[PDB]
Amino acid sequence: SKVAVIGATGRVGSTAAARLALLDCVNEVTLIARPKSVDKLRGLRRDILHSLAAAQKDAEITIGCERDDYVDADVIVMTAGILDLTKDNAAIIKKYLEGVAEENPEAIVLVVTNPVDVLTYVALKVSGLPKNRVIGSGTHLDSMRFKVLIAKHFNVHMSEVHTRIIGEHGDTMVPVISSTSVGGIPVTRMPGWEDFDVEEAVREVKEAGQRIIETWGGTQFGIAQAITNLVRTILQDERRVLTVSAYLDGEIDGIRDVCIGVPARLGREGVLEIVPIELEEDEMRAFRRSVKVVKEATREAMEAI
Amino acid sequence: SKVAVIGATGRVGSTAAARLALLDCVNEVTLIARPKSVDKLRGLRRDILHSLAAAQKDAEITIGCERDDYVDADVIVMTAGILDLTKDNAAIIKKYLEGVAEENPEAIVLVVTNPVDVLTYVALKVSGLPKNRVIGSGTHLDSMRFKVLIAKHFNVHMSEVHTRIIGEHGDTMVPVISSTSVGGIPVTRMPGWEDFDVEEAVREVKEAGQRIIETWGGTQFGIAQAITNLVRTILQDERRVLTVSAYLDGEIDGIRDVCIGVPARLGREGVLEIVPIELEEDEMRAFRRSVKVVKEATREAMEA
Amino acid sequence: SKVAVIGATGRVGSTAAARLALLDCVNEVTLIARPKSVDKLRGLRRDILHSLAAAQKDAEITIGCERDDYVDADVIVMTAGILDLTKDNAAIIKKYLEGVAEENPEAIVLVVTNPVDVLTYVALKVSGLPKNRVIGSGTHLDSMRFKVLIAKHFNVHMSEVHTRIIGEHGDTMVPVISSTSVGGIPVTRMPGWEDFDVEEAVREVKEAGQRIIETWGGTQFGIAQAITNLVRTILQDERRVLTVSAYLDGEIDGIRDVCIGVPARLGREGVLEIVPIELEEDEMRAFRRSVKVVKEATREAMEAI
Amino acid sequence: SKVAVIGATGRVGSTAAARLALLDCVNEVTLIARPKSVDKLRGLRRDILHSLAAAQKDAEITIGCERDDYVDADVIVMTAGILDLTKDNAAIIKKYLEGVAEENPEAIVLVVTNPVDVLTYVALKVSGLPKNRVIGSGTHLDSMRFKVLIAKHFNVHMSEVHTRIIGEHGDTMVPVISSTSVGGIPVTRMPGWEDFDVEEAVREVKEAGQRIIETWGGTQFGIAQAITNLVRTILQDERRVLTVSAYLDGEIDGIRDVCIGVPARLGREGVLEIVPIELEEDEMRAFRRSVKVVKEATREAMEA
Ligand SMILES: NC(=O)C1=CN([C@@H]2O[C@H](COP(=O)(O)OP(=O)(O)OC[C@H]3O[C@@H](n4cnc5c(N)ncnc54)[C@H](OP(=O)(O)O)[C@@H]3O)[C@@H](O)[C@H]2O)C=CC1
Ligand SMILES: NC(=O)C1=CN([C@@H]2O[C@H](COP(=O)(O)OP(=O)(O)OC[C@H]3O[C@@H](n4cnc5c(N)ncnc54)[C@H](OP(=O)(O)O)[C@@H]3O)[C@@H](O)[C@H]2O)C=CC1
Ligand SMILES: NC(=O)C1=CN([C@@H]2O[C@H](COP(=O)(O)OP(=O)(O)OC[C@H]3O[C@@H](n4cnc5c(N)ncnc54)[C@H](OP(=O)(O)O)[C@@H]3O)[C@@H](O)[C@H]2O)C=CC1
Ligand SMILES: NC(=O)C1=CN([C@@H]2O[C@H](COP(=O)(O)OP(=O)(O)OC[C@H]3O[C@@H](n4cnc5c(N)ncnc54)[C@H](OP(=O)(O)O)[C@@H]3O)[C@@H](O)[C@H]2O)C=CC1
Ligand SMILES: [Cl-]
Ligand SMILES: [Cl-]
Ligand SMILES: [Cl-]
Ligand SMILES: [Cl-]
Ligand SMILES: [Cl-]
Ligand SMILES: [Cl-]
Ligand SMILES: [K+]
Ligand SMILES: [K+]
Ligand SMILES: [K+]
Ligand SMILES: [K+]
């Protein structure tokens, strides 16, 4: 399996490529950058190879700056980026991913560049790939953090909690308490749920990104591990129900023609299906509002081309 | 951490000891059997030590036939076993576990011998240990098997399924669909649930044991891995919600004075609590029917 | 990958199949027995499936009693067995493995039935397979135990010790101190080597089998884990230098036409090569004597057919 | 176990803290930097906590800028760093690690800041800690890289190769072919050793650092994983023989009063001993030449 990382010179790309190389299901990682940044990729390549030696792991680490270098990959991770920024990043998506289905119709693309929901739609539109082979990180990490917050409240092993945050990876994210469980027990029926402040929790999840930006400079190790989790789930055909930004086609509320954070059973074929989750009234209204923000943002992004 | 396996010369005990010794959290395993069966334990000890060498793992393997060889263990796994059956096995429980708490009050006892729910109660009574430190395998394996069947039906990663079979480790076991979820979604709302035959699944779970006995002679690898799973959850203080035979004290429908399969958050201190699971009508009726059978069988065991 | 276990009803076969199913590189385990023992395989199949559920692992467990059931396997493990016993077991080898190369020339056979060195030669002769795809457990476990004994003497992590016992899996086994090292340092130069009694150690390794036989009934968990280690090394193409019973063709002392415990670099193709280890005078003499015992035993076994 | 990372705002420190927090043996990581850089640590703390959530792992992440925030750590990883360079870095060592043993005598210090061998000596002197509890990354990564090159040459599993680069973490490093083995066989007797260019391999090992700095800006992931490997060996008392910068006291050729890369059996108590490795003529000459450079550079650092 070959995983290409476009934007490997950045904080997210660099750390993603390092942790992806450690996966046993990844035999080759190709670092992609602008032609005037490949020399920096030569250093990153050596540093990662040193990490593998230390961890007693093996992977092929190649470098390049052209379409021929990453088009044949099994997974293409887009981490290259910076209203007008959504423009410029959307253009980057286009330059890299336009017409990929013609050379490799079996490619899987995972977009991380923000706005992730908008740019996954751009990636799918320009790529020509099937809707099941183009996704974005979306609210995956947000859901995993919410999962930990609940597990710590009830003081149970993390694996016992199943939860998800759907919608935009941003202010309009929606927690789905209606499909949240602790050891299979609906969380509303668990002792102590009354003492969990869902709103504070969501707030902690929603603002963390901006707080990290103004202090450490931006997310790095968090998003990198989330990418690793998604790529492993795919390449090892694990068929987990993960919350990622995917193209909706009526599976939830007949909502259609948008890419947004939703539960998806993920395997080697990409999105095997979007789980038709049934939302309560409030959850449905918040989810509809979130779709409204993403669709308008997607329209402006496409108008820009 | 030291784990003692009583009944280590048997099918279950031997295999349990072997897989327990592979755990990083288990630094010593003590093989316990009757005095006449000591030499057999010497060979099993060496065989397990060979397994550790091949797995590049380590563990101190000790052997004994006396109380002083296991009373100070952190976990005592009870696999020694022959109504006439329950009586003799309860006598074995009493012989080995009477007055343990007087010498090791922090010991944890895991009962595996059948009837496990009954003998779990016997163990707690004769042990004098706290209710939270005496449990049984119960329907733990039954729940994990049910989990795989649901997972294979929806074709999802097994970790996505959380389900549970509570009550007797036997014919009166009760599946808790009310507390069964896939990715957090109530299983009733998952697409395709109509095509899942719950009753046929339960039959496969409750009947397999008899089928294995009639063919291979009895379960072995399955129960040994379940023992390994339970002991690791305890010694590593993982705080998982597993279904084990434990003493009920009014957590579910105010039922009391019985050891039966229930959800319990397990850690290094044992049963941290029995989760107050809310059951729907039919499930409640079946569970109460199962508590009746277990309580009756327990009184006869205690009387002898 | 499919691994067939012939003799799965026995102590070694049963436990081998259970631990092999737990390997991520093994997707199917086929239990093979005599037609009048398949019903017992039905119980073992269920018990193993229960073990996987408990360990949260997956494997396909099939059963059968004919050549069509195991001939297409990727690895065929022979654990079916009981001078005259060497006869009867050799006949069993023949019944199961004669002409396998005609239906599956890429099959790999791992013999465990004793005498392991003799019966690996029988298996290779009757199978028609290439010499690199037929081996036996040999002195693999014996070497691993010797490795632990040395590591405990020097109180170092086991991974630091590299050693091997070559020759017959029996009284004529030979320790190769000349190729024994602790962290790469020749063990003869390590502080405290003078306090290690090699003879007692070898004795502990040589007699353990008989002592276990007269007490617990025979080896079970030890040999099963050794089989698992060998199958994993093969199916995952790990290219370790493991000591197994293999066909010698002049790689050591120009010794040829015998199967005996020797170091072999092992991968998906079986024996990639027998490492031409250079033995000291005493080690060479003991190794030559061991070959003499195996060759005579092999001749008598073949005369029996 | 609590591991403190001083210099956590930097490339190495941040990445080191992230991978350390993933270790099961590390329950707490304390991020330490200068008072003005505290808010930056808040963001790094949250980023690492996100990584743990995604990896389904746990760890308490603390932050500080004072001695009291790290003196009680079990392992203190020194990654804070700017001859004028060595002097300033030695001043940093002194500021952070002076008098640690007075408050935490069982602390273990791992020095990473370059020149690592020199600053390891500085750390030991100013710390007052025992010689066995102060080490440096030294040629640990250099040895692991050399191991992979030999392994790829013979096309064997990497675990089959045991090799070692001792001496200075720099130009005067010395490979110990005399103590290099493949599967226990002396590498000199392994078929194909003639086709292995040792000198070209050493050049690739000693020059890569400069190449990474001139391109990516400096090493990061490699050294962070090496730190993670060393800390795990200590906290899990694995007793591996790893090459680290440690205080020599006559174990190799009676050389004394210098911290330099040498084989050391590492456990929870630190350097359990420096293995008395026997070197052949040329290797001995190169090692003595390297001890000269390190001792000289160490005296100048101490003088300032
Ligand atoms: N949860 C989420 O969805 C997260 C989203 N992200 C997104 O990831 C992206 C990268 O973030 P980060 O790595 O911190 O940013 P960095 O500035 O560290 O790296 C940016 C990367 O983009 C490349 N790049 C920038 N402009 C162009 C261009 N015009 N053409 C080609 N390549 C270009 C850079 O290459 P060069 O060195 O040549 O400039 C570099 O590889 C951002 O868009 C960010 O929003 C980040 C974290 C989490
Ligand atoms: N709850 C569950 O899920 C499961 C329950 N079990 C129960 O485990 C028990 C053991 O099963 P199994 O291992 O197959 O049986 P075996 O006959 O194979 O082993 C029985 C063990 O009990 C010992 N034992 C027998 N009689 C006595 C006695 N009077 N006093 C002391 N020790 C005695 C035996 O030692 P010795 O050799 O000296 O006789 C041996 O160690 C049974 O009660 C069985 O029902 C088994 C599997 C699953
Ligand atoms: N280090 C080593 O090399 C080791 C070698 N071994 C060898 O493994 C072999 C099996 O040992 P173990 O499992 O303890 O023995 P068991 O008696 O427990 O099992 C024997 C197995 O062989 C089968 N078998 C016996 N006779 C025949 C026959 N005529 N035709 C077909 N199948 C037959 C049995 O089937 P059924 O039930 O129908 O009889 C059963 O599957 C022995 O030869 C032993 O020497 C064992 C351990 C270690
Ligand atoms: N031995 C080895 O194998 C390796 C050695 N190293 C060494 O590690 C050190 C750090 O490298 P790197 O992380 O890339 O460097 P960075 O500049 O990225 O980080 C330096 C770190 O040191 C801190 N620091 C700088 N000046 C001072 C000071 N005067 N007092 C206190 N803290 C200070 C910085 O904090 P702030 O942000 O507040 O300035 C920051 O945490 C260097 O000395 C380098 O040579 C690196 C890699 C490998
Ligand atoms: Cl990282
Ligand atoms: Cl998710
Ligand atoms: Cl359970
Ligand atoms: Cl087993
Ligand atoms: Cl070996
Ligand atoms: Cl090393
Ligand atoms: K890899
Ligand atoms: K252990
Ligand atoms: K498997
Ligand atoms: K941790």
The DSSP string of chain B is -EEEEETTTSHHHHHHHHHHHT-TT--EEEEE--GGGHHHHHHHHHHHHHHHHHTT---EEEEESSGGGTTT-SEEEE-----HHHHHHHHHHHHHHTTHHHH-TT-EEEE-SSSHHHHHHHHHHHH---GGGEEE-TTHHHHHHHHHHHHHHHT--GGGEE--EEB-SSTT-EE-GGG-EETTEEGGGSTTGGG--HHHHHHHHHHHHHHHHTTTSS--HHHHHHHHHHHHHHHTT--EEEEEEEEEESTTTT-EEEEEEEEEEEETTEEEEE------HHHHHHHHHHHHHHHHHHHHHHH-
- Distances, alpha carbon B81 to alpha carbons B70, B245, B246, C51, in Å: 17, 17, 20, 21
Please tell me the number of the ligand nearest to residue B223's CA.
2
Q: D291: annotated binding-site residue?
A: no
Residue D110 CB less than 6 A away from ligand 4: no
Query: Which CATH number is A50's domain given?
Result: 3.40.50.720
Atom of ligand 3 nearest to the CA of C222: 48
Q: Per residue in D286-299, is it b (16+ CB within 10 Å) or e — as a string?
A: bbbebbebbbebbe
DSSP code, position A75: E
| Experimental technique | X-ray
Q: Sign of the CA dihedral B186, B192, B194, B198?
A: negative
Q: Are residues D157 and D177 in the same domain?
A: yes
- Residues of chain A with Cβ-Cβ distance to D161 below 8 Å are none
Q: Compute φ and ψ for A303, nearest 5 degrees.
A: -45, -35
Stretch (H or E) spanning D257: strand D256-267
Q: Hey, are the CB atoms on A160 and B240 less than 8 Å from each other?
A: yes
- How close C31 gets to chain B, by Cα (Å)? 13
Is B169 in the active site? Answer: yes
Cα angle for residues A301, A15, D47 (degrees, 5° grid): 80
Q: Hey, are the CB atoms on C162 and D160 less than 8 Å from each other?
A: yes
Helix (H, G, I), strand (E, B) or coil at D28: strand
Largest CA distance in chain A: 58
- The Cα B91–Cα C167 span in angstroms is 52
CB A227 within 8 A of CB A201: no
Q: Are residues B153 and B289 in the same domain?
A: yes
Q: Nearest to residue A78, comparing CAs of A167, A1, A4, A20?
A: A4
Which residues are paired to D166 by β-bridges? D174
Q: Are residues B123 and B177 in the same domain?
A: no
- Residues of chain D with Cβ-Cβ distance to C276 below 8 Å are 191
Q: Are residues C192 and C116 in the same domain?
A: no
| C78 C-alpha to ligand 3 centroid (Å) | 9
| D268 vs C: CB within 8 A | no
Atom of ligand 2 nearest to the CA of B219: 47
Which two structure tokens, joined as six digits, stand for C193?
């080597």
- The Cα B106–Cα C12 span in angstroms is 38
Domain end residue (candidates: D136, D169, D202): D136
- Distances, alpha carbon C225 to alpha carbons C75, C232, D72, in Å: 16, 10, 43
- Which residues of D have a catalytic role annotated? 169
Q: Are residues A126 and A221 in the same domain?
A: no
Q: D288: annotated binding-site residue?
A: no
Which residues are paired to A64 by β-bridges? A32
**Cis ω for the linkage preceding D115 (within 30 of 0):** yes
Q: Nearest to residue A167, comparing CAs of A158, A156, A175?
A: A175
Distant-in-sequence, close-in-space partners of C199: CB < 8 Å, separation ≥ 6: none
List gaps in chain A by the residue before each (C–N > 2.5 Å): 82
CB D284 within 8 A of CB D252: no
DSSP code, position D298: H
Resolution of this model in Å is 2.0
Residue D17 burial by Cβ neighbours in a 10 Å radius (0-12, 13-18, 19+)? buried
Atom 4 of ligand 4: nearest residue by CA position? D112
Query: Which CATH number is B200's domain given?
Result: 3.90.110.10
State how beta strands D161-162 and D181-182 pair. Answer: antiparallel
CB D216 within 8 A of CB D237: no
| A176 vs B: CB within 8 A | yes
| A234 vs D: CB within 8 A | no
B184: nearest CB among A181, A239, A278? A181
Domain end residue (candidates: A136, A151, A182): A136
- The Cα B142–Cα B206 span in angstroms is 8
- Distances, alpha carbon A203 to alpha carbons A172, A200, D78, D239, in Å: 11, 5, 35, 46
Q: Are residues B46 and B73 in the same domain?
A: yes
Residue A301 burial by Cβ neighbours in a 10 Å radius (0-12, 13-18, 19+)? buried
Can you tell me which residue has the tokens 């465990």? Answer: C112
Q: Are residues C11 and C103 in the same domain?
A: yes
Q: C244: annotated binding-site residue?
A: no
Q: Nearest to residue A113, comparing CAs of A248, A301, A304, A255?
A: A301
| B132 vs C: CB within 8 A | no
Beta strands in C104-214 (DSSP E): 108-111, 134-136, 161-162, 165-166, 174-175, 181-182, 185-186
Beta strands in C167-293 (DSSP E): 174-175, 181-182, 185-186, 240-249, 256-267, 270-274
Pocket probe for ligand 3: among C84, C87, C113, the residue whose CB has the most ligand atoms within 8 Å is C113
- The Cα D149–Cα C164 span in angstroms is 24
Can you tell me which residue has the tokens 């300033």? Answer: D88
Can you tell me which residue has the tokens 């901006």? Answer: A210
Number of domains in chain A: 2
Q: A114: annotated binding-site residue?
A: yes
- How close C211 gets to chain B, by Cα (Å)? 7
| A60 vs D: CB within 8 A | no
Alpha carbon A173 to its chain centroid, in Å, reads: 15
Which residue type does C293 have?
A: V
Domain end residue (candidates: C104, C119, C136): C136
| C176 vs D: CB within 8 A | yes
Q: Sign of the CA dihedral C204, C209, C215, C218?
A: positive
- The Cα C34–Cα A182 span in angstroms is 48
Best mutation target, D262, D272, D274, D275, to test chain C (most C CBs within 10 A): D275
Which residue type does A136 have?
A: G
Helix (H, G, I), strand (E, B) or coil at D192: coil
Distant-in-sequence, close-in-space partners of A37: CB < 8 Å, separation ≥ 6: A9, A65
SS3 content of chain D, % helix, strand, coil (to 5): 50, 20, 30
Q: Are residues D150 and D270 in the same domain?
A: yes
C221-235 and C11-21 helices cross at what angle (nearest 10)?
A: 40
Which residues are paired to B244 by β-bridges? B262
Q: Are residues B161 and B230 in the same domain?
A: yes
Q: Which residues line ligand 1 (CB under 6 A)?
A: A 7, 9-13, 33-34, 37, 79-82, 89, 92, 112-114, 116, 137, 169, 218-219, 223
Q: Sign of the CA dihedral D147, D148, D151, D156?
A: positive
| C18 vs B: CB within 8 A | yes
Residue D95 CB less than 6 A away from ligand 4: no
Q: Are residues C192 and C127 in the same domain?
A: no
Q: Compute φ and ψ for C32, nearest 5 degrees.
A: -120, 140
Helix (H, G, I), strand (E, B) or coil at C276: coil
Q: Hey, are the CB atoms on C159 and B46 less than 8 Å from each other?
A: no
The whole domain housing A232 covers 140-304
Listed by number, the residues of chain C in 22-41 with a beta carbon closer than 8 Å to a beta carbon of chain B are 39-41
Q: Are residues A161 and A290 in the same domain?
A: yes
Which two structure tokens, joined as six digits, stand for B294?
């277990």
Q: Hey, are the CB atoms on B222 and C53 less than 8 Å from each other?
A: yes
- Beta-carbon count within 10 A of C98 CB: 16
Residues in chain D: 304
Q: Are residues C130 and C144 in the same domain?
A: no
- How close B255 gets to chain A, by Cα (Å)? 18
Q: Hey, are the CB atoms on A222 and D54 less than 8 Å from each other?
A: yes
C281-304 and C116-127 helices cross at what angle (nearest 10)?
A: 50
| B59 C-alpha to ligand 12 centroid (Å) | 4
Radius of gyration of chain B (CA): 19
Q: Per residue in D32-41, is it b (16+ CB within 10 Å) or e — as a string?
A: bbeeebbebb
- The Cα B31–Cα B114 span in angstroms is 20
Stretch (H or E) spanning D77: strand D75-78
- Residues of chain D with Cβ-Cβ distance to A222 below 8 Å are 46-51, 53-54
